[PDB]
Amino acid sequence: SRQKELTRWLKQQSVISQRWLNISRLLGFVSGILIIAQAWFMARILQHMIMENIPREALLLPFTLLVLTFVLRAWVVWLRERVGYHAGQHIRFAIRRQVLDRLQQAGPAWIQGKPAGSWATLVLEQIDDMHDYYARYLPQMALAVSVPLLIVVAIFPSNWAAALILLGTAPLIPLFMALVGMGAADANRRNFLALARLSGHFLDRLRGMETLRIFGRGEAEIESIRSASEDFRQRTMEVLRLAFLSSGILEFFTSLSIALVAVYFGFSYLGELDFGHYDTGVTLAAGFLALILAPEFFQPLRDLGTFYHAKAQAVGAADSLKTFMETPLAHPQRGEAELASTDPVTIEAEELFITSPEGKTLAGPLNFTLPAGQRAVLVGRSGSGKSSLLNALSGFLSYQGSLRINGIELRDLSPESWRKHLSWVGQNPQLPAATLRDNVLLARPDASEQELQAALDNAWVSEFLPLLPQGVDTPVGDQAARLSVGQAQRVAVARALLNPCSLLLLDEPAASLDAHSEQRVMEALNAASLRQTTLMVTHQLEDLADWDVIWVMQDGRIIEQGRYA
Amino acid sequence: MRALLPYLALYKRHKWMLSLGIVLAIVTLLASIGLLTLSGWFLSASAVAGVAGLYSFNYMLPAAGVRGAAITRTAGRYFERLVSHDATFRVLQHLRIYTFSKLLPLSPAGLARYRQGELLNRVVADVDTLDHLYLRVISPLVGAFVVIMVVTIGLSFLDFTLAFTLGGIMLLTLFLMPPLFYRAGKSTGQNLTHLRGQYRQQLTAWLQGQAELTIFGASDRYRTQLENTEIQWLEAQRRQSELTALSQAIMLLIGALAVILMLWMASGGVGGNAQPGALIALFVFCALAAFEALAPVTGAFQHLGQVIASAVRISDLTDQKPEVTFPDTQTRVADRVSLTLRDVQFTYPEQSQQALKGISLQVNAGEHIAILGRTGCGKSTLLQQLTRAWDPQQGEILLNDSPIASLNEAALRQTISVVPQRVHLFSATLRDNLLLASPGSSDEALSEILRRVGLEKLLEDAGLNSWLGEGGRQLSGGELRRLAIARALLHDAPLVLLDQPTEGLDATTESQILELLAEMMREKTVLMVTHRLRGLSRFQQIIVMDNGQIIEQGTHAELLARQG
């Protein structure tokens, strides 16, 4: 029911490159044609020099044509799966553009739900799992039905008995695979649970080696790895005695067919058997055509067996991708209005509900007014939706209710132009630029260096500049070039203060910071919260006396609205 | 290369199962070649003989060969797949034990410089691809070489100049095509792997920074260079799919040259025979059927590079020296601790922080020291030296008037039972999670201790048979904290180091644990390291420290006056 529905999804995706998946079917038919042409030419040559003892140079025309059939086959093979890659690249490129468009539009609220490592397996590993299905499986799934049928059609005019040995095994191969498939699927459910908890046993023990040492179990979990590896082998070797029986059935019928073709033709030339030929004595050339083509008959079905593993992983990777694209999403309405002025704005709210992308309401009915250019700290209990109001003002969360910015409803405001008057300082510092010089200039990358220096010392990011190796342009990538938490946060402050803003939001800037940086972060922000209307969510109740308004938020509601009285 | 030298010694433990899996690969390939070569000759020999030569021609022997070669082709491939996969799983056990025996003595220190996220997932993916050296590389390369040799030797009984051109061409592509294509696709293999991890870090920093990119308008132009990395990355995957196209097209042309040469040369004469007759098809059908031995060869050698890649990414990770060494003095753990560290000035590697500025404190047996310091104080670094994750420089730590270095690892781990801040669920049965502390504990003792701690919801159903960790009964914070304490109670060490026991717990659980600690860990020297001020009133001593220095010490009071 589901696995059938996922396969239908994989077909809907394979439409960008339907042109490239038709030339893999066409070149499969052409490559099939060239096998008979090769096989027929070789039989014509071989019969002439064996039976009629024709010299080498009188067969110079079939040799010249046999070379072409060999060069053409090599060209088609090179051409066939370059088309196959081009097909599979276009699904991966088009879907990865749909996934990113689904994440960019969903916003940071939906993105933050899962770790960024689990998002980058969806965009990298899940999508690249689907290449070898449109590139190698689907083209081969149709070369496995044309080439075997095209070979039999070529042999049938020669003999109806040599083309019946090959066509005789056509129903038997899937019939015997089903008989061995019952035993295999029995062992795939009995041993499925045990092999799911034994496959991740090594990484389980390999992680948490810090707990193994502190209790002295380092030498006693080597024995566990010895028993979890001897038990994973025994169970897999039970599954594999049946997975190599189904595979070896096709190898049984491809050698029975060659044995039968060789015996039937060999005995027919001697006179024991005379039923196959159409009342005309079977020729040597008619036996070489069938013997050369007997292995080529089963090769397409053999390759399909190797590429069939890509069928399963492209369906599993289509489960993660499909449900990702079928999750309903509530995202903020794209407005069209703009802000008349960059003068600090006035916030107003009445019976405001903030809706998660999941669909639930994080902050209940809350009403407040924030006059222009007045700091207002928002302190409350943990988990009470205090950070949700900051997201809703940034445009990351969709709200049903009334939230108007400077007299204009936030829904009508165009996000591209609303966020030109907005600045934010998050709790955890997230630097997305390559170099520390471009992180500060993230707001505008062409700002004058003289202005930049006035922004660097304002946030006191320059005091720890000499400690960094390269100075201002020190690489800040997360790997091997890091800064201190209180250092990568003081550069987030400089990024926020580089460009003046109408509304400035602070989401617990001084969290998990050393006491040295926390002093310099706050008094850099405590002077930056007066020029424009500021809405801060702080964990520390201390030293908020010089804050115009305090809102206490319990269970997503403004209960205690006071002035630190 | 030579990076495989330590790992080829693990394959030598099972060398008769790997050899049997290669001999069966040679036999299966010789049966495939023999079946078609005998079939090609049988058709030609009988057709030439015709009806007239029926009685003179002995067809029973060639008819038994095709039946014999067909059976050993099907049974040989079934048993070659079984024996070679079975030997692969046996070596996998030796690769895992070897990797785990090496990464264990450097578990806290050596792996700290890397990141635990990718490092631990890379080791599993590199051990898995070292295990496939035999199937992907050795079996196709050595199976083909012996098949080429036996075919060449066998065909030399008919004509010497024909066996050495079919064998010569076949050998000249077993040794030339794999290296000429590994060398041709070496830049792409480097370029593709670099661009894959470059797109990964540009995507993670685009997703994690989506809140700080959207506001400042860089979300569009930081995706534009993210999609330009993919364009470069996809162009380095096509160039790798054009080396597989060229290798399959060339292998089809070389197997075409051998067939055409056999049609031309063998028709001239086979073994000093003007009219070879049926011997033309024996050589032509040998050239046709001998090039599926060389089908795996060219993709096998590129796999050697990946195995070389993963054989050095582990052989430098497992060859870095342990930070500390434990002399096997065979000491005996005492019933009391009396921990004392005269002076400990310790500094991290590649860090000028020097978290311990030379601190000093003395703990008597039975005391309940409770070190207090705000975040970033390096207070947990003190608990690292006591378990000897790092040894201090110019420091003296004594344990019952004997230095911590003198104790062997077998006794140090039994002397000190630490509850870590991150407690790891082992994804095993709950009985196997707590027997980690004390292996000899009886089944009754497990239920009692798990009762006294307060984890009764675990023993309600399948208490010692339930599967905890991944794919099982996961535990929550504060319900997993009682597991860390439960293990420390089984371990029954005289000293108990607690690292933030109540870091993230609500009021009701934190109050229980503080009483849970004091009631049971009463006769045991306890050194508890927290940044919380609640339960210090029951501790016989409190140490208040900042930036690795003791400011307020000797305060038998509930907490630092200013801290209150």
Interface test with A, best of B188, B210, B495 (most A CBs within 10 A): B210
In a domain, A478, yes or no: yes
The amino acid at A76? V
**Domain end call among A326, A358, A392:** A326
Cα angle for residues B314, B315, B316 (degrees, 5° grid): 90
For A256-415, list the strands marked E by DSSP.
347-355, 361-370, 376-380, 398-405, 408-409
Residue A551, number of CB atoms within 10 A of its CB: 22
Longest dimension (CA), chain A: 116
Q: Are residues A465 and A558 in the same domain?
A: yes
Beta sheet of B359-362, edge-to-edge order: B359-362, B339-344, B396-399
CB-based contact A255:B35 (threshold 8 Å): yes
Cα–Cα distance for residue pair B22/B142, rounded to 1 Å: 7
In a domain, A333, yes or no: no
Counting Cβ atoms within 10 Å, is residue A44 exposed (0-12), middle (13-18) or buried (19+)? middle
Q: Are residues A375 and A258 in the same domain?
A: no
Distance of residue B125 Cα from the nearest chain A Cα, in angstroms? 10
DSSP calls for B349-366: TT-S--S--SEEEE--TT
> What burial letters (b/e) apply to A432-464, b meaning 16+ CB within 10 Å?
bbbbbbbbbbbbeeeeeeeeeeebbebbbbbeb
**B297 — phi, psi (to 5°)?**
-70, -40
Residues with their C more than 2.5 Å from the N of the next written residue in chain A, i.e. before a break, are: none
Distance of residue A209 Cα from the nearest chain B Cα, in angstroms? 6
Cα–Cα distance for residue pair B325/B328, rounded to 1 Å: 10
Distance of residue B145 Cα from the nearest chain A Cα, in angstroms? 23
In a domain, A83, yes or no: yes
The amino acid at B511? S
Copy the structure tokens of residue A50.
Answer: 């064996």
Which residues in chain A are contacts of B35 at CB distance < 8 A?
255, 258-259
Q: Are residues A182 and A281 in the same domain?
A: yes
Cα–Cα distance for residue pair A375/A373, rounded to 1 Å: 7
Cα–Cα distance for residue pair A479/B522, rounded to 1 Å: 45
Copy the structure tokens of residue B483.
Answer: 């597991």
For A411-526, list the strands marked E by DSSP.
422-425, 503-507
Whether residues A120 and B217 touch (CB distance < 8 A) is answered with no
Is A374 known as a binding-site position? Answer: yes
Beta sheet of B549-553, edge-to-edge order: B416-419, B495-499, B525-530, B368-372, B541-546, B549-553
Strand A376-380 and strand B495-499: the pairing is: unpaired
CATH number reported for the structural domain that contains residue A185 in this entry = 1.20.1560.10
Counting Cβ atoms within 10 Å, is residue B328 exposed (0-12), middle (13-18) or buried (19+)? exposed
Tell whether A60 lies on the interface with B, counting CB pairs under 8 A.
no
Sign of the alpha-carbon dihedral angle for A214, A215, A219, A224: negative
Q: Are residues A125 and A201 in the same domain?
A: yes
In a domain, A335, yes or no: no
Q: How far is CA A150 from the centre of its chain?
A: 38
Closest alpha carbon within chain A to B425? A208
Is B374 known as a binding-site position? Answer: yes
Tell whether A176 lies on the interface with B, counting CB pairs under 8 A.
no
R_g of chain B computed on alpha carbons:
35
In a domain, A334, yes or no: no
Strand A408-409 and strand A398-405: the pairing is: antiparallel
Coil, strand or helix at B62: helix
Q: How far is CA A19 from the centre of its chain?
A: 24
Which residues in chain B are contacts of A244 at CB distance < 8 A?
78, 81-82, 85
User: Per DSSP, what are the bridge partners of residue B372?
Assistant: B530, B544
Which residues in chain B are contacts of A198 at CB distance < 8 A?
none
Q: Are residues A124 and A12 in the same domain?
A: yes
Copy the structure tokens of residue A41.
Answer: 């030419």
Whether residues B44 and A196 touch (CB distance < 8 A) is answered with no
Cα–Cα distance for residue pair B475/B430, rounded to 1 Å: 11
Residue carrying structure tokens 């080498």 = A56
Whether residues B245 and A82 touch (CB distance < 8 A) is answered with yes
Copy the structure tokens of residue A132.
Answer: 């070898």
Copy the structure tokens of residue A88.
Answer: 């599979």
A60-111 and A20-50 helices cross at what angle (nearest 10)? 160
Q: Are residues A105 and A178 in the same domain?
A: yes
Its domain, for residue A40, covers 1-326
CB-based contact A28:A146 (threshold 8 Å): yes
Helix (H) or strand (E) segment spanning residue A366: strand A361-370
CB-based contact B280:B273 (threshold 8 Å): no
Tell whether A200 lies on the interface with B, counting CB pairs under 8 A.
yes
In a domain, A342, yes or no: no
Copy the structure tokens of residue A514.
Answer: 């050393």
Alpha helices in A191-220 (DSSP H): 192-199, 201-206, 209-214
Tell whether A275 lies on the interface with B, counting CB pairs under 8 A.
no
**Full set of structural domains in chain B with CATH:** 4-316 (1.20.1560.10), 339-553 (3.40.50.300)
Is B286 known as a binding-site position? Answer: no
Q: Are residues A85 and A52 in the same domain?
A: yes
CB-based contact A467:A307 (threshold 8 Å): no
Q: Are residues A277 and A353 in the same domain?
A: no
Copy the structure tokens of residue A162.
Answer: 């040599």
Whether residues B67 and A430 touch (CB distance < 8 A) is answered with no
CB-based contact A331:A395 (threshold 8 Å): no
Tell whether A271 lies on the interface with B, counting CB pairs under 8 A.
yes
In a domain, A336, yes or no: no
Cα–Cα distance for residue pair B339/B402, rounded to 1 Å: 10
Q: Closest Cα partner for A561 from A405, A349, A391?
A: A349
Cα–Cα distance for residue pair A184/B344, rounded to 1 Å: 63
Distance of residue A514 Cα from the nearest chain B Cα, in angstroms? 6
Q: Are residues A398 and A253 in the same domain?
A: no
For A233-314, list the strands marked E by DSSP.
none
Residue carrying structure tokens 């009188």 = A58
R_g of chain A computed on alpha carbons:
36
Of A217, A267, A292, the CB nearest to B436: A217
Q: Are residues A313 and A398 in the same domain?
A: no
Residues with their C more than 2.5 Å from the N of the next written residue in chain B, i.e. before a break, are: none
Cα–Cα distance for residue pair B118/B204, rounded to 1 Å: 13
Cα–Cα distance for residue pair A53/A46, rounded to 1 Å: 10
CATH number reported for the structural domain that contains residue A366 in this entry = 3.40.50.300
Hey, what's the torsion of the CAs at A311, A313, A315, A321, to 10 degrees? -140
- Split into its structural domains, chain A has a count of 2
Q: Are residues A140 and A271 in the same domain?
A: yes
Of B73, B246, B277, the CB nearest to A251: B73
Residue B134, C-beta contacts closer than 8 angstroms, at least 6 positions apart: B11, B18, B21, B84, B87, B88, B91
Coil, strand or helix at A312: helix
User: Per DSSP, what are the bridge partners of residue B235?
Assistant: none
Is A13 known as a binding-site position? Answer: no
Which residues in chain A are contacts of B418 at CB distance < 8 A?
214
CB-based contact A397:A332 (threshold 8 Å): yes
Q: Are residues A463 and A409 in the same domain?
A: yes
In a domain, A331, yes or no: no
Residue B290, C-beta contacts closer than 8 angstroms, at least 6 positions apart: B33, B147, B148, B151, B166, B170, B258
Counting Cβ atoms within 10 Å, is residue B353 exposed (0-12), middle (13-18) or buried (19+)? middle
CB-based contact B42:B62 (threshold 8 Å): yes
Q: According to the 3-state scheme, what is the secondary structure of A78-123?
A: HHHHHHHHHHHHHHHHHHHHHHHHHHHHHHHHHHCCCCHHHHHHHH
Interface of A with B in 480-519 (CB under 8 A): 492, 495, 512, 514-515
Which residues in chain A are contacts of B188 at CB distance < 8 A?
none
Strand A361-370 and strand A408-409: the pairing is: unpaired
* Distance set, CA B269 to CA A49, A60, B37, B152 (Å): 11, 17, 18, 18
Conformational region of residue A87, where left means phi above 0, alpha means psi within -120 to 50, and beta covers everything else: alpha
Which residues in chain A are contacts of B121 at CB distance < 8 A?
203
Whether residues A216 and B217 touch (CB distance < 8 A) is answered with no
Of A222, A263, A512, the CB nearest to B66: A263
Is A370 known as a binding-site position? Answer: yes
Whether residues B78 and A245 touch (CB distance < 8 A) is answered with yes
Residue A223, C-beta contacts closer than 8 angstroms, at least 6 positions apart: none
Method by which the model was determined = cryo-EM
Cα–Cα distance for residue pair B3/B23, rounded to 1 Å: 26
Coil, strand or helix at A405: strand
